[PDB]
C-alpha cells in the first residue's frame, strides 16, 4: 500500500522551466489517509545531480536507499501525481530521514 515516506520511481515529465523533470525517485509526503482513498499522491522529487544540501529545503539521502548515487530530497519541488505515475517501489525513508523531510517541508511552505 502507498505509504508516506515510501520512495517510488516516477515520470515527472513533462515539466516547464526550472521545474524538476525526468524519471526519478520521489518520496510520498501526503498523509496516509489521503494515500488510502485518493487517486493521487503528493511527492517530493529526489535528484542525484547534487549530494549536499544547498538550501534549508534540501535533505540528502545516503546504498542504504537503493539509489544510483548519493542524492538530495528537493522539498521545494513538490507535486501531486496520479497514482498511475508510480513505477517500482525503491524503498522507504527511515523515521529519522522523514523527520528531516518534515522539517524541510515546514520551512518550505512557510509553516514554521
Amino acid at each position: 500500500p502507498i505509504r508516506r515516506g515510501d520512495v517510488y520511481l516516477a515520470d515527472l515529465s513533462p515539466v516547464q522551466g526550472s521545474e524538476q523533470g525526468g524519471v526519478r525517485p520521489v518520496v510520498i509526503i501526503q498523509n496516509d489517509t489521503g494515500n488510502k482513498y485518493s487517486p493521487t499522491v503528493i511527492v517530493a522529487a529526489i535528484t542525484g545531480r547534487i549530494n549536499k544540501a544547498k538550501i534549508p529545503t534540501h535533505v540528502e539521502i545516503e546504498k542504504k536507499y537503493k539509489l544510483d548515487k548519493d542524492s538530495v530530497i528537493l522539498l521545494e519541488q513538490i507535486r501531486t501525481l496520479d497514482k498511475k505515475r508510480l513505477k517500482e517501489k525503491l524503498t522507504y525513508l527511515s523515521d529519522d530521514k522523514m523527520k528531516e523531510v518534515d522539517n524541510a517541508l515546514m520551512i518550505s511552505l512557510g509553516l514554521n
Binding site: 545531480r49 547534487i50 549536499k52 544540501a53 544547498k54 538550501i55 534549508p56 534540501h58
Partner: peptide, 16 residues
Amino acid sequence: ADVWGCISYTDYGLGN
C-alpha cells in the same frame, strides 16, 4: 562554482 545554481550564494543558501 556550484552544480546547482546561484541560490547557494544568497542569504537563503547554506554555503555548501
